[PDB]
């Protein structure tokens, strides 16, 4: 009974302190920064061969190889430069909502409605891709996957809980709790010591991977957060919501810096990504388009008109030389 | 592709493309049906030819030169809105209801209304099954169908009671171009695959009418 009052007043103290820091809005400091101009980007590649809708995609750290997951039960590894199909992996279950590419490139991960994260070893002595391990323990579907090393991976489920695994042993090293709704995405910090997760409770929180503790929690979205990504320097991140807006949060300031809404936008964002510098913010919507945002001034700097269906995934190469987008029309398109 | 090793890589890519195409062909005669309903609704015992195969359960019985896949999403215990779009392309939705569980009738109706009007299922037809007639006939005599539906005004006979139940379920459509194929089945009813097949036949024909430009 009394704790409820204590809970309410603690929230007020956070907000009151949060209000003290705000002196000038992000848009009010960077008003005299010259714009970026119309960002005209044209398709360069069109990877076709996926039959059903594409739900996930990840870039190799070498900025040349790709991995994409489709509802047809196939996981294809593409050579971006030539459009060659390096690998094609059959999946046990055709309901896949995520996929990840290991930093070393030796392994690849997959998961979905089956509640299992499957890990496939690509560099085998037998010349074929085999499932090295299957990770179980989540009681709901799997939303995201991100490798930390060759022997450590982070997952998020609709169970309202994230986890950290030890692929060698196969058990669950640490479990992160605190969300009150489905967890829909996460992005690993560049130094791989913290990460953030966007949930359906209209909130995102910052987690210490080593300590298994929630360091911070960020609010402001009116609906579920569909996607999330770290700023390149690791001191901010951006979230995409069904609210039809994206927002930029700062860890040190611990607030929301800017919003990326336009009156002509009505649908929700499905993916979010940054450029190598961090000035462009690319997000994919349900209107079959991706908008490039001048993250420093919140202006539509361009549109990637393409695809005949919803855009489900986004990606930018570690070198920043290309952008890849997948859609429900079963096509990946590379832009430059 | 000039280089000798780049020529062999191009060959490997084509061998993959060929296998992808063949797999698509072999998985083209399959009709995907989504199973829904509350617990103890008979959703696990519709067609006695199961051949099954926590998470998502699939069943892949075959009948009359056609491959039917029945997907059961029970046990997810999550918010449907975030995984329902995965089934946007199913041919039809099979819905099961238990006529002998009055206290669960309201939950079934709430489920039906939400699914029938989902933005993703604006075009997918529904096959409503009203299971366990025999218990319904035995239970109605002892307990009138007034406690579950206080607004019921018709007689207390089996024929009239069932029609009212079906009417309420059909009353949630609130849209054209989507039809509901309601049927009544018992525990000892072997001909359940036949009902799904012919209903799917009408669903397929209706879709072709749209594709062929006749609608």
């Amino acid at each position, epitope marked *: 009974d009394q704790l409820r009052q204590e809970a309410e007043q603690l929230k007020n103290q956070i907000r009151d302190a949060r209000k003290a820091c705000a002196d000038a809005t992000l848009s009010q400091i960077t008003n005299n920064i010259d714009p970026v101009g119309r960002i005209q980007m044209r398709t360069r590649r069109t990877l076709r061969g996926h039959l059903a809708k594409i739900y996930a995609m990840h870039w190799g750290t070498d900025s040349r190889l790709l991995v994409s997951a489709s509802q047809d039960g196939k996981l294809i590894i593409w050579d971006s430069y030539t459009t060659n199909k390096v690998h094609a992996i059959p999946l046990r279950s055709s309901w896949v909502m995520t996929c990840a590419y290991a930093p070393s490139g030796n392994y690849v991960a997959c998961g979905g409605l089956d509640n299992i994260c499957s890990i496939y070893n690509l560099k085998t002595r*037998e010349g074929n891709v085999r499932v090295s391990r299957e990770l179980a323990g989540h009681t709901g579907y799997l939303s995201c996957c991100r490798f930390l090393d060759d022997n450590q991976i982070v997952t998020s489920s609709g169970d309202t809980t994230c986890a950290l695994w030890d692929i060698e042993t196969g058990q669950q090293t640490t479990t992160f709790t605190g969300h009150t709704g489905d967890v829909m995405s996460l992005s690993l910090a560049p130094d791989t010591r913290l990460f953030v997760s966007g949930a359906c409770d209209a909130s995102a929180k910052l987690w210490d991977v080593r300590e298994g503790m929630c360091r911070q929690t960020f609010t402001g979205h009116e609906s579920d957060i569909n996607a999330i990504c770290f700023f390149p320097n690791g001191n901010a991140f951006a979230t995409g919501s069904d609210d039809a807006t994206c927002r930029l949060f700062d860890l040190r300031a611990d607030q929301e810096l800017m919003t990326y809404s336009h009156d002509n936008i009505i649908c929700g964002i499905t993916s979010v990504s940054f450029s190598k510098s961090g000035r462009l913010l690319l997000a994919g919507y349900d209107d079959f388009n991706c908008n490039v945002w001048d993250a420093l001034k919140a202006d539509r700097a361009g549109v990637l008109a393409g695809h005949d269906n919803r855009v489900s995934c986004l990606g930018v190469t570690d070198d920043g030389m290309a952008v890849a987008t997948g859609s429900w029309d079963s096509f990946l398109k590379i832009w430059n | 592709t000039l280089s000798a090793e780049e020529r062999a890589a191009l060959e490997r890519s084509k061998a993959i493309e060929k296998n992808l195409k063949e797999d698509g062909i072999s998985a083209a005669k399959d009709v995907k049906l989504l199973l829904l309903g509350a617990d103890n609704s008979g959703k696990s015992t519709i067609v006695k030819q199961m051949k099954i195969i926590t998470g998502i359960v699939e069943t892949h019985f075959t009948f009359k030169n056609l491959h039917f896949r029945l997907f059961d999403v029970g046990g997810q215990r999550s918010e449907r809105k975030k995984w329902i779009h995965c089934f946007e392309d199913v041919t039809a939705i099979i819905f099961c209801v238990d006529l002998s569980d009055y206290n669960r009738m309201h939950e079934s109706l709430m489920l039906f209304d939400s699914i029938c009007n989902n933005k993703f299922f604006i075009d997918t037809s529904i096959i409503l099954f009203l299971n366990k007639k025999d218990l319904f006939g035995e239970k109605i005599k002892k307990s009138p169908l007034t406690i579950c539906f206080p607004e019921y005004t018709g007689p207390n006979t089996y024929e009239d009671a069932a029609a009212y139940i079906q009417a309420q379920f059909e009353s949630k459509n609130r849209s054209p171009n989507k039809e509901i194929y309601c049927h009544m089945t018992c525990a000892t009813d072997t001909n359940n695959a036949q009902v799904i097949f012919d209903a799917v036949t009408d669903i397929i024909i209706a879709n072709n009418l749209r594709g062929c430009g006749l609608y």
Partner: single-chain antibody
Amino acid sequence: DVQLVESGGGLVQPGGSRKLSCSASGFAFSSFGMHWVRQAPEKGLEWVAYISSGSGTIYYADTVKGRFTISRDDPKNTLFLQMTSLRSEDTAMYYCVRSIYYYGSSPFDFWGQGTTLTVSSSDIVMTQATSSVPVTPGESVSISCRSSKSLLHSNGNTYLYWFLQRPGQSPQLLIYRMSNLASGVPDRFSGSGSGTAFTLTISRLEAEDVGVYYCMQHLEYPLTFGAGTKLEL
């Protein structure tokens, strides 16, 4: 484990015919291109024939074109070589090799054990200047082999392979394009070069590094080897 075992060699009369069989066991044989390489008594490796995955592409050396034919039996996991009219120049130990081609692969990693065949009685040229190189353990060594054309390509990949053959054993892959360490070899080996001059350098030489080192070009068929450089202890 991976295993290629060959059989069918022996003594044949000139003008006769024989068939060599190479049975694979322990990998996805259907996905690997397969080569035949022969080494006449104390002469040096020489490429013979190549059959791709799915049997789409077949190549032969000019020496054996018309006489030899290479066939693959995927369901039975066997590789064949049919030799029709054998001269006295075909006597050699024939090796069965495996090659898989995709972006970033190692296409000559595993070699067969070899079968001996005895018969009674334009191209890129790669040269290894030195034939022998005395050395003691713990001393750095360097081996170099030139070429006619520049093995560098528009891709930026230099197509040069380094193989080490130990006394009485089949060759082993060390460096597959110009500097990439083949899986399983110690990190002491290194490779470098530019265009037409290459060098393989060994640091902290061990007692197991004694053998013959061959350099091969995979830029375009027919594949050609070097003369070979021998290390003496």
